[PDB]
Amino acid sequence: QEDISDYVAANMKDAISRTSGVGDVQLFGSQYAMRIWMNPNELNKFQLTP
Amino acid sequence: FSAFSSSRWEYGSPRLERYNGLPSMEILGQAAPGKSTGEAMELMEQLASK
């Protein structure tokens, strides 16, 4: 689902929303973002914080 | 700056173009004398097809 949503948002959503007669285009998904999933235990081990 | 930096010579675009939100490159041309714009544009489309 992530890959299909990212392709639609990054290759299809902008052009479709810019098409003649199109108003609001709602994505049933989300674009890829660089997700950094932090581990509190690892942060504590290295005395670090978000 | 030499203590914490290195220098290189590379290549880069001095002017980047985009068309309808996507990276683009513009090409201007003209149909040969005795030839209409329509057929020249069709030939350009066939050339782009490859």
Side-chain angles (χ1 to χ4, degrees):
Chain A
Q1 294 179 356
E2 276 183 17
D3 300 11
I4 300 160
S5 314
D6 170 70
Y7 187 86
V8 173
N11 301 71
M12 301 169 58
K13 188 176 189 294
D14 278 340
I16 292 284
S17 56
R18 185 179 296 113
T19 295
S20 53
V22 169
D24 203 47
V25 174
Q26 216 274 332
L27 181 75
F28 305 129
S30 62
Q31 294 179 357
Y32 281 166
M34 189 60 49
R35 310 303 315 226
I36 299 91
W37 307 106
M38 315 162 289
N39 189 343
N41 309 330
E42 294 294 328
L43 290 170
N44 218 46
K45 179 167 59 161
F46 299 107
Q47 295 297 289
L48 290 177
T49 311
Chain B
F1 263 70
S2 66
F4 50 76
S5 72
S6 66
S7 284
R8 286 144 46 196
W9 276 101
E10 54 162 50
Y11 265 75
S13 184
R15 185 185 96 135
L16 289 166
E17 297 176 353
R18 291 176 86 77
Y19 188 71
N20 284 328
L22 294 150
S24 79
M25 282 193 188
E26 189 174 358
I27 293 158
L28 294 163
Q30 65 183 357
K35 300 291 179 74
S36 178
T37 61
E39 57 199 328
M41 287 168 39
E42 304 200 38
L43 172 55
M44 210 69 209
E45 291 174 55
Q46 308 171 234
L47 286 167
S49 179
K50 300 289 94 175

